């Protein structure tokens, strides 16, 4: 009975309407739909044992009909926000059984969900980020396919001309994945760190997703510290050869790497690091030099410097020291 009304209101929200010559009836309909959604958000959030098997296709269908749309070059956000909200509470519910939902949340669904990441609305990409993070976490049989399709988006962003507004949100999800990796890093993961994450520093629009990219690179080094050398050497490779404020970005990422670096791995790249660091101190741009000089306010770096002053000091101040 109450299950029947749930399905009714769900299907009721599958009706897209428009009144070209009746703005008053249009507001009534949008209010009814907004109300029904809010009622269902409150319903599945604070009630237990309400998510029965027959409603699973009803929810996924309601989400698909509303969200899987053809993106413009939104305005109806009060409705879209509720749909995202409702679907999230649905996924996060303790009554949620992925073994039943895997029938309806498949690869095509995940694929269409990723299309929406190209949205220009920061609010929407945030909901999508959370939603895809839930699906990856509760659907073990989708994890492999999701990583594959995200890897494709990056490859088309770096190499191909395909720009993407959701690069940051995707990296934020990836950081959540990397942090929970197994003990020995799979070869595909190491390749991903090197063939994908590092060339992401090459793209011109780095400013948008660099904080998220830096976190991913750091998390990779927190797992396997064997990867510290090819990462650092790559950052020095992709380093802005021309003195520009973009160096501040790299200096920030480079200090965050040094915070979690192994002393034995530090010495493997301490020379080409401080050669570049010396150039930054000598930069015509004050902001770059100011940022590089801030390295000395880091206690752990000092320990690495002091215990390696025989190799570092000649590079930083060649006027005062010799090798």
């Amino acid at each position: 009975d109450q299950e029947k009304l749930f399905i009714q209101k769900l299907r009721q929200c599958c009706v897209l309407f428009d009144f070209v010559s009746d703005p008053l009836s249009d507001l009534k309909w949008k209010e009814v739909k907004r109300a029904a959604l809010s009622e269902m958000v409150e319903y599945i959030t604070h009630n237990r044992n309400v998510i029965t098997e027959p409603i699973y296709p009803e929810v996924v269908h309601m989400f698909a009909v509303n969200m899987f749309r053809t993106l413009p070059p939104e305005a109806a956000w009060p409705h879209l926000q509720l749909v995202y909200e409702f679907f999230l509470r649905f996924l996060e519910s303790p009554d949620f059984q992925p073994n039943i939902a895997k029938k309806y949340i498949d690869q095509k669904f995940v694929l269409q969900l990723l299309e929406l990441f190209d949205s220009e609305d920061p609010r929407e990409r945030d909901f999508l980020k959370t939603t895809l993070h839930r699906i990856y976490g509760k659907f073990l049989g989708l994890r492999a396919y999701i990583r594959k399709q995200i890897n494709n988006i990056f490859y088309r962003f770096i190499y191909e001309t395909e720009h993407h507004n959701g690069i940051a949100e995707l990296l934020e999800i990836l950081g959540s994945i990397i942090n929970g990796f197994a003990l020995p890093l799979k070869e595909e993961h190491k390749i991903f760190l090197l063939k994908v994450l590092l060339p992401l520093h090459k793209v011109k629009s780095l400013s948008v997703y660099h904080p998220q990219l830096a976190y991913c690179v750091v998390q990779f080094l927190e797992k396997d510290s064997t990867l510290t050398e090819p990462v650092v050497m790559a950052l020095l490779k992709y380093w802005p050869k021309t003195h520009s404020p973009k160096e501040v970005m790299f200096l920030n990422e480079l200090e965050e790497i040094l915070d979690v670096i192994e002393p034995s791995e530090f010495v493997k790249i301490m020379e080409p690091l401080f050669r570049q660091l010396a150039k930054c101190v000598s930069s015509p741009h004050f902001q770059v030099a100011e940022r590089a000089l801030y390295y000395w306010n880091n206690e752990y770096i000092m320990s690495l410097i002091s215990d390696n002053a025989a190799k570092i000091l000649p590079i930083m101040f060649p006027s005062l020291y010799r090798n």
Partner: peptide, 11 residues
Amino acid sequence: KKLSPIIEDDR
């Protein structure tokens, strides 16, 4: 509110 870690598994 940063996303909670997702522990890698086998399936």
